[PDB]
């Protein structure tokens, strides 16, 4: 029965790498059952999360290195308490739902997947404090 | 039973009317000389085919020397053996530098641990274990670690003379 179950886990994972074109690796360290249940309710539309056991992920990824081999460089970010948030919406509306909603004494984000590229979740939340001057703080260099 | 040797023993049924040139069979045999080797060929050949040596002949005896006799290796040994109450199959590992060595200690071991004399033991198969960590039995596996080293505590030097004028030390 454990041969059955595990097999299917790859299935509902292999089906989230083909569907969605981006992925958040979140760090659900602590973060109770209840809290994690409510982030499901607050992402019911676009996003979906899939919590997984590590040694089943690091192997299923490597075992999926056929098609979608870009996911290969996820592995060095799959340590610790991690989870998978798949989406198609922009960065700073899904990650803004995640990092914010529900906390006490909140789950974080550790990295971001995009078209075979990684984002430190910091260089995905630009406050336009260098995005404006990218054609302005050097535009005076042309005059 | 002494210092063991391995022998290729080859023999065939005697030729006849209907079968000029019958089929050759070969065994590898750990015995201590040729006379035993050939006898242990005919022992098994009675039990496998139904040849009696009276109606057969021994085409060749060749000593199979060890290929790399100064390369330590891990042998897997499969044994059928007879006990006071039953007859059983075994598998054990023996670490040594040669096939013939392995067998000697196999035969000693079977005799110390299970009280099995040479006669009550068929050697099924003896084969080098190519991939380490195919090694199954721990008493070998513990010699396979990286940078293995151990001491040899309490060393008892044998004395020549019967009296000694100093109280000895065991200090290796």
């Amino acid at each position: 029965g454990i041969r059955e179950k595990k097999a299917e886990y790859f299935a509902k994972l292999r089906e989230y790498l083909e569907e969605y074109k981006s992925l958040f690796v979140v760090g659900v360290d602590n973060v109770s059952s209840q809290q994690m249940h409510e982030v499901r309710k607050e992402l019911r539309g676009r996003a979906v999360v899939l919590m997984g056991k590590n040694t089943m992920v690091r192997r299923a990824i490597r075992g999926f290195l056929s098609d979608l081999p870009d996911f290969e460089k996820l592995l060095p970010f799959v340590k610790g308490n991690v989870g998978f948030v798949f989406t198609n919406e922009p960065l700073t509306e899904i990650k803004n739902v995640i990092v914010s909603n529900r906390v006490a004494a909140g789950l974080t984000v550790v990295q971001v997947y995009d078209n075979g590229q990684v984002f430190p979740s910091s260089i995905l939340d630009i406050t336009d404090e260098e995005l404006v001057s990218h054609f302005v703080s050097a535009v005076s260099t042309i005059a | 039973m002494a210092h063991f040797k391995e022998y290729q023993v080859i023999g065939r049924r005697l030729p006849t009317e209907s079968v000029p040139e019958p089929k050759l069979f070969r065994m590898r045999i750990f015995a201590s000389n040729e006379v035993i080797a050939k006898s242990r060929y005919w022992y098994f050949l009675q039990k496998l085919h139904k040849v009696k040596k009276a109606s057969g002949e021994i085409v060749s005896i060749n000593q199979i020397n060890e290929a790399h006799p100064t390369k330590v290796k891990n042998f897997g040994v499969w044994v059928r053996y007879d006990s006071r109450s039953g007859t059983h199959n075994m598998y054990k590992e023996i670490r040594d530098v040669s096939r013939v060595a392995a067998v000697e200690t196999l035969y000693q071991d079977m005799a110390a641990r299970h009280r099995a004399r040479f006669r009550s033991i068929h050697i099924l198969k003896v084969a080098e274990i190519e991939k380490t960590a195919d090694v199954k039995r721990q008493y070998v596996k513990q010699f396979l670690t990286k940078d293995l080293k151990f001491p040899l505590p309490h060393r008892v030097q044998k004395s020549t003379k019967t009296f000694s004028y100093k109280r000895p030390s065991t200090f290796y």
Partner: protein
């Protein structure tokens, strides 16, 4: 199967030092100092550093290797006893005859003496080992409390007092009387 090497580890907490020579362990911490003669066991000690000492048994089999773990534990209780210390509580248990317990002494002795046990005219005496100290709880009825640096001398002294109260010739399921060890713990670090 004869194990080529097998070892154990002894964490040396801050404050205590431990010196070992010809297998005679000396252990000094805040509470004081304990020694043990482990010569009866072939174990070889090695100090990695003042925080951590290792214990090894070379080329030994089953039982020899079994002595290892117990040697570690012995050196451990030496340490915890010389830091947290040990404290066994007991309880007088009697259905009709109150058990009168006191400390008397003959030639600077210190015995635990026990009176009226099940209506007994006999006066029981348990010597108090050196290093173990006997106090009587003030907020727990009929308590008594032995404490000191070694579990061993404490535990024994407790068992010693509890043994002396065994009840002969009665169905000991009915006649539950005695003094039983009710708590085993430390002196520091709560109770």
């Amino acid at each position: 199967m004869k194990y080529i090497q097998t070892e154990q580890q002894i964490e040396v907490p801050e404050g205590v030092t431990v010196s070992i020579k010809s297998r005679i362990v000396k252990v000094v911490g805040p509470r004081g100092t304990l020694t043990k003669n482990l010569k009866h066991i072939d174990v070889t000690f090695t100090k990695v550093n003042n925080q951590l000492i290792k214990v090894a048994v070379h080329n030994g089999g089953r039982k020899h290797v079994a002595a290892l773990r117990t040697v570690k534990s012995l050196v451990d209780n030496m340490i915890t006893g010389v830091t947290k210390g040990y404290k066994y509580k007991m309880r007088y248990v009697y259905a009709h005859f109150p058990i009168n317990v006191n400390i008397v002494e003959k030639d600077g002795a210190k015995f635990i003496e026990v009176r009226n046990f099940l209506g007994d005219k006999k006066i029981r005496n348990v010597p108090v080992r050196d290093g173990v100290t006997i106090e009587f709880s003030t907020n727990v009825k009929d308590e008594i409390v032995l404490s000191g640096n070694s579990v061993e001398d404490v535990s024994q002294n407790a068992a010693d007092l509890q043994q002396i109260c065994r009840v002969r010739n009665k169905d000991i399921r009915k006649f539950l009387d005695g003094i039983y060890v009710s708590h085993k713990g430390f002196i520091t670090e709560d109770l």
